Amino acid sequence: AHKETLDKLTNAAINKINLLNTSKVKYLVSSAFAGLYVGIGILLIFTIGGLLTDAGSPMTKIVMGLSFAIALSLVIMTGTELFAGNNMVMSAGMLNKGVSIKDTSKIWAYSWVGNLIGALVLGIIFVGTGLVDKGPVAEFFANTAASKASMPFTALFFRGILCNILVCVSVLCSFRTNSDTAKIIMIFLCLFAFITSGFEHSVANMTIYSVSLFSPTISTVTIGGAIYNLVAVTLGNIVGGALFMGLGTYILGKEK
Amino acid sequence: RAHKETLDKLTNAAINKINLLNTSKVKYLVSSAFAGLYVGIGILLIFTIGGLLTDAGSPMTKIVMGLSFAIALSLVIMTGTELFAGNNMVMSAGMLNKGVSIKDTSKIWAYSWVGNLIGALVLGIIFVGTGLVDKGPVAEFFANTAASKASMPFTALFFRGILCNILVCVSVLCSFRTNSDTAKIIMIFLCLFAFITSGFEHSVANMTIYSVSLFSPTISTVTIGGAIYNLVAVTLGNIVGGALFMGLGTYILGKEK
Amino acid sequence: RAHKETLDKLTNAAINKINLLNTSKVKYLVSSAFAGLYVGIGILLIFTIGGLLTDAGSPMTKIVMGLSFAIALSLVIMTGTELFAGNNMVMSAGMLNKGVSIKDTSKIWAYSWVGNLIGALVLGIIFVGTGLVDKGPVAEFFANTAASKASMPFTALFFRGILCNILVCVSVLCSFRTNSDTAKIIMIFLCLFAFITSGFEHSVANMTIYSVSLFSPTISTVTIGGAIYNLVAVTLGNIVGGALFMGLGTYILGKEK
Amino acid sequence: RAHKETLDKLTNAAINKINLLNTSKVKYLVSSAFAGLYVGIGILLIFTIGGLLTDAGSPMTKIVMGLSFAIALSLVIMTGTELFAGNNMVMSAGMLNKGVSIKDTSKIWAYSWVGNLIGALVLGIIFVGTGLVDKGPVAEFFANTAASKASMPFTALFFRGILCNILVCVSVLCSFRTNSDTAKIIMIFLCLFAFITSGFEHSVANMTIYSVSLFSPTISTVTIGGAIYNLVAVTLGNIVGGALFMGLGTYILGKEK
Amino acid sequence: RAHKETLDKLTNAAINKINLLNTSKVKYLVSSAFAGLYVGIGILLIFTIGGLLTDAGSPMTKIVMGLSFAIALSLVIMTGTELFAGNNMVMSAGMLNKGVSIKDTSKIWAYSWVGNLIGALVLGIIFVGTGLVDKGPVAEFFANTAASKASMPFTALFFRGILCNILVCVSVLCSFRTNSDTAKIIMIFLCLFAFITSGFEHSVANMTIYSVSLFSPTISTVTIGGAIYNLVAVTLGNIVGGALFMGLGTYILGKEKLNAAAENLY
Ligand SMILES: CCCCCCCCO[C@@H]1O[C@H](CO)[C@@H](O)[C@H](O)[C@H]1O
């Protein structure tokens, strides 16, 4: 089914750019939504992170895994626009010559900034709830924000590669099935696997950092680091969805 | 992406709704009353689970609660009954697309919300009549939880309503975007898991929290004053979630212009 | 929204039943006793779980129990056999809709009910002969639970029976409003989780509880008379719940007036 | 209800089974061989969990074993292979509705049972070629379990075998009454969960418990004798559930008279 | 029923493998590099869970691992890429029904096994580049386990390998026997749960166990003295399991003896 699958991606990447050109507003709103949806997955699993860490549980990371599925299922079911997702779609619509290389940069920049707006809004709204005034949920937000930015560039970059491989292969699957339940199941597996192994997702991290920098619970982060993390993780995401995933699928599916 | 397809579904749903309310009150109110009591049933369950695990000081309590809430919207979706929270996105998207009046939207909203409250009252009543809240760790969960919800700063509540109806309305958005009933239940299952466990606030459900709390004699931690104070703030937040985010957001994605 | 196409089905099934009964008392009763026995299986499984987990002092006891009862209405639905409680609403409507009579409806409720009971008795006899209720925490869980059911005030039982059959019948309502069998089961499993774990009462599962409790000679807490007290209060609650509520409501939603 | 259609379905499945033994003994035995081994896989996994959770004092042992047994009957349905248990309902229903003869049924039963036994033997052998039962609590679990089943009183095993094949068969009955492969797998998971955990007896499953426990050089307290004793009692038990309840029951429900 | 209607599918499908391999030695190898990596993704995940619960000393350890391995074959099937252990059945059953040939089998078998190999390796370096195996119970879990699997008698690894593949292949068999994708994944999860938790030996997944072990800083307790050895036993095993049993067995069930234009069963 590889050729049809290429034609599905190719065709998908043409609709992205087609969309951006007609309405920046629709395009950025679609992306804001996706950034939010992913964030909501963070709200949930950090809440859980906070709960079980306080407890002493060896199960904390496993359950955060299980619980993350809502992040990409929401994106997939809503047909909203996600950065990492597009790393592969465009990276292979481009090799198929459905879209220009610079069609592919406009999409990446807009979807990523669009996602970031979804994050900041979510974070702002999440802080108004007081759910991170203080407490273990708010210390989890704060401690995770810190470790992620205080980790070397190479470590982050490679975790970024394995994250999008997985996020992207999850999107890939949505093109290769017509069951919506298989889509959701596969998203849940790939998200379980990436969160639990310890891989880094740029757009998720926008909500981690967006929340941490809006909560007057004094952390130890600083923008330099968040931006540092987001640069490090984002390229890897690109490498993981564009290179591996994006290129491999063009390869498998192209009538040469 | 079917954004416009989607918006047209939302637009027909707002229409049929106001036709239904206009065409025949008592049906609209029975539809709503069922919704209101289906939601409440997920309170009965998750608070039984609340009282059970909290007595044990289990760290899983809220997680398991979040997990056990799916029934509330699953039932509403699969019976095709009228919930207030979902009406915030449907009517709002529908008003912008000129399918419905603003006061169509107004009526629908006030009705479901009141209809729901009626199903929550009955439920609260009948549930007290079971003696399951006569005393012990479960009564205590209803009393501590109705108290803390009603003593919370308006701002915190308001914002908690927004994040909730974003979750509820999008789980309902999903149901418009798929023809798999299992997919609907799964998505709903995920949304309610996120919003219960994350700590977001849902007016129609709080109805049953205060219904149970005000009808029960062994529950005297809250008053008929907080309940209203909670429903007002939480509901308002809910409306913002549904109309201002989902409702206007879906209208933006789908509108030919 | 399709509450008319749904009141058609409820009427159509309320009809296809009494036609079955008028045409074969034996075919009807074989189906009844099957569902009584299908329901009883979940009682066996969950009381096993009951006995294992109580004996250990898990706070999870009632929860794992709820989670594990889905088989009861699952077998019923998937084998399209006759179950009392599911009929409180299916006869409720059909008649109110003028498709079957007050006559064809007391008929269904004694047959389905007694047939069901036959299934319970036969499961009891066999399960006892497994020796699985000879000595220990499973036979203890049957003893302990059977008494508490029989020493509880009529009123509490009544109300716990209303809620049980709103959930039970709404799971049946769901099986009618969808074509996905997987979704039917998810929905059954949700409603079964919420009624068992909440503490609501089910007439037909209880037939098995007392069936097992009595036929077992290592169990001496019960007597018939107390099992009768329980069954009459619970059967009446079920009826109200499925009949006044789901019966009356769904006719009201689907009736073109 | 589509009982008539369900009973024609079984009748034609019973026809296809015998026409297939007759056509080719080897293909039938191979199919039966596969089912005994697909069932064995289950036992290997749930006995691994058996050993693990047991050596660890956990009250969830038997609950997890039941939850974990689904693969056994799932692989059988999904592979379309020939399982003794199932043939009890199908052959009988099929002979009752005058589609196959008593000799057809006895030959199917005898053949599929020996076919099943062969699969059990190979698996057991190959499993001992793992060293996973050389020593440690997984071996010890095949050891004490194999012995308690061989030493149980005949009546108890007999009745345990009835309840077991009612569950196995009603779960084959469901795969006949749905077109959804996911819903077949859920109903199988539910039924196996119920039969494993409540303590019911399954012949073909025991073949592997004895296939493993014998060939395993790490020893115990077993004897072919005891294994044979278990098998006989449990087979009779299974046959009664399968043919006398399920075969006969479904026959009475779908027969056009 | 429907075993011949099945057998045509493994048949019509053994072909298509050889075909596209004949047509694109690179289109085919990337398609195998992937599979091996999808499988390795299963290992990083469940191995992270081993470290976690093995360092906590939990009894649930091997159970939860088995319940978590599903992602491995689920991605192969859903992506429709090339995996060695699966090929065994399909290629085997392929000859028997006379659609594809012995040398093809062992070639696809040879180019399946090798596509899978890379993926473990690439994935191997990358995961170690995460520094997620520099220090700790996961780094550890990965080493020990890499030890035993090769510090284990040949006879264990062989039979632990045929069983793996009965299970791995029977899941592939089910994905041939349903048009339900959700049904596919579920049966893949049942089989992978059973096979991981019982403790059966999977070739491709060990390609990645061993990559991460060599490739690591904090080492070893290994030497390729293990690998090759371990892999060589399990594979052989894997083949038999899929080839001997599943391949020939499905042929037998499938073969309409109006051929018969050759041999007679009963
Ligand atoms: C309020 C937020 C609006 C952000 C809009 C950003 C749109 C990005 O626009 C892109 O910028 C790239 C450089 O970054 C260029 O290479 C592309 O040509 C251009 O399309």
Ligand SMILES: CCCCCCCCO[C@@H]1O[C@H](CO)[C@@H](O)[C@H](O)[C@H]1O
């Ligand atoms: C516990 C979760 C199990 C989910 C099982 C989902 C089974 C769906 O199964 C699939 O549904 C599709 C509709 O979406 C149909 O088009 C397919 O024919 C069917 O195979």
